[PDB]
Each structure stands twice: as C-alpha cells, then as structure tokens.
Design a protein around this ligand. Structure first.
Ligand SMILES: CC(C)[C@H](CO)Nc1nc(Nc2ccc(C(=O)O)c(Cl)c2)c2ncn(C(C)C)c2n1
Length: 277
C-alpha cells in the first residue's frame, strides 16, 4: 500500500474502486484498487507486465500511471487525480456543450488517442466516464490499455462490427466511440443509448441505415450478422445533430462510417478543416 493516507472513495470505476489519497509527502493521487472476480486465482506475471508497460504512456491527454502496487491477492494502480469526468459535466449542461468547448475536448481526445494508436495501444471502452477533466479545461483519458490486461454493461459506445462479434485487434473501434461522444457533447443526450446488444444495433441502424453488402462489403462475414435485420434508410445528419456547422457534421460522418475500413483515423481526424476553424 506504498504509504498513502486519507483514502477517500471517489466511486466505483470500470475495473475497481477509485480513491483520492495523499502520499506521505502530501501530494494528491488517484488509487484504483482492482476488483478481482476470483480472489483466489491470483494475478499472473504476464498481466502485471502488460499493465506496467503503460507507465511508458506519457502524453498530456493520457492519465499518467505512476505505480503498480501488487501485494497478496491485492492490486492497486496509482494515477494522477483529476477533479471531474465529462459525464458529470454533461449532466449539468442542458442541451450539451458550447461549440468551442466540444471542439476543444474532441481535439484533446483525438490527440491522446493518436498517441496510443501510434504505439499499438487500444482502449476499446471509451465513454464520458473515462474522459477526465481538470479545472483548466484539460481533458485526459483513463484506462487506455487496460482492456488488453483485463478484457450493467454500457454498450452505447460500441461499434456495430464489435456488437456483431468481431474480435480482431483494431484501432477503428475507438474512433466509433469518439464519433458517439462527439454527438453526445453537441446534443446533450447520448446518440445510441441501447438496452441490449440487439437494441443497440437497432438504434444505430435506425439513424445510419441498415448495412448491406453494397455499403459495407463483407458485413455478411461477421458471426452475429443477421440477414433478417429490419431495413432502415439513413437519416440526413442535420436532422439528429444540432449546433454543428458543416465541417463538424462532415468530420462526424467520417467517424460514424459503419464499415471500419472506411472509418477516419485519429490522425486523419486531427487534419480535418473542423479544427482549422
Ligand atoms: C466513477 C468514478 C470511479 C470516476 C469517474 O470516472 N473514476 C475516476 N474519477 C476521477 N476523478 C473524479 C473525482 C471526483 C468526481 C466526482 O464525482 O465529483 C468524479 Cl466523477 C471523478 C479520477 N481521477 C483520476 N482517475 C484515475 C483513477 C484514472 C480517476 N477515476
């Protein structure tokens, strides 16, 4: 427990409970105590190695990992502390964020993602709960790389190929989640708040169109593709987006391509005219 005190529970995060604490030097940290489904199983050395490599992620928009504390069927990660998450901010912003704010958060999110992607680190569970925000307006991403170590459930940010059973390593999956978060920041409200896997696909297809072999070649190869999906035409973007100019809609349309091979990358998104304005 590397001598920390004043453990204050922030709440229950994705892989465990998070506490604000101070060290014996009086500096502030966030401690994540990893929840172990099978207490007896123990954490293998390969897992400890996969988490510790994440200390090498040093970027102004990635939450810094300082330490990995492993003692006796107990696993604690020491991170920098941030004061809020984007979910808690969006909860008190009626209608969503001002255009200048959403653009500033999207830029920072894509920068942090570009950095990890260049190192072949995936997130795969991006959501407003893991986009942390300080009082200076700086956005930093939490939990990048942890899905590789660790694998009720929010489906709202999951790409349709993942929902249909794709399992391949791919950077495209995080870009879908960014597009869903972008729309949430401008609309106020989540874009595809599904209640199950089947309903999550339906919410997506109702807005963006049911996929087929012509608009997504090779879609029929996904394990849970269903040749009976209801057929929905795509809606015009202007009709379910608000407070976004032409460039913003354009950028958003590129992140929400159903076919992952046509989806914009993080670095491509950072070059888009939306950010020159
Ligand atoms: C749900 C919890 C566990 C949380 C939000 O994602 N995780 C969570 N919240 C943090 N900060 C706060 C502090 C206070 C509040 C508040 O409620 O006022 C919130 Cl939401 C976040 C935080 N800082 C570093 N980390 C690392 C551990 C990465 C954090 N993880």
């Amino acid at each position: 427990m590397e001598k920390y005190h004043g453990l204050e529970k922030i709440g229950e995060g994705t892989y465990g409970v998070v506490y604000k604490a101070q060290n014996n030097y009086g500096e502030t940290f966030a401690l994540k105590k990893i929840r172990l489904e099978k207490e007896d199983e123990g954490i293998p050395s390969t897992t400890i190695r996969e988490i510790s490599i994440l200390k090498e992620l040093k970027h102004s928009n990635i939450v810094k990992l300082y330490d990995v504390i492993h003692t006796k069927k107990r696993l604690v990660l020491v991170f920098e502390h941030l004061d809020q998450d984007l979910k808690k901010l969006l909860d008190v912003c009626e209608g969503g964020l001002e255009s200048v704010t959403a653009k500033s958060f999207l830029l920072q999110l894509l920068n942090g993602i570009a950095y990890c992607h260049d190192r072949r680190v995936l997130h795969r569970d991006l959501k407003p709960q893991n986009l942390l925000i300080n009082r200076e307006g700086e956005l930093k991403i939490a939990d990048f790389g942890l899905a590789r170590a660790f694998g009720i459930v929010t489906l709202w940010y999951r790409a349709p190929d993942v929902l249909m059973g794709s399992k391949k390593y791919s950077t495209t999956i995080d870009i879908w989640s960014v597009g869903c978060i972008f729309a949430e920041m401008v609309n106020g409200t989540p874009l595809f708040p599904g209640v199950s896997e089947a309903d999550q696909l339906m919410r997506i297809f109702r807005i963006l169109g049911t996929p087929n072999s012509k608009n997504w070649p090779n879609v029929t190869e996904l394990p849970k593709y269903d040749p009976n999906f209801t057929v929905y035409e795509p809606l015009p973007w202007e009709s379910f987006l608000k407070g976004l100019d032409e460039s913003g809609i354009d950028l958003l349309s590129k992140m929400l391509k159903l076919d992952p091979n046509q989806r914009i990358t993080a670095k491509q998104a950072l070059e888009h005219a939306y950010f020159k304005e």
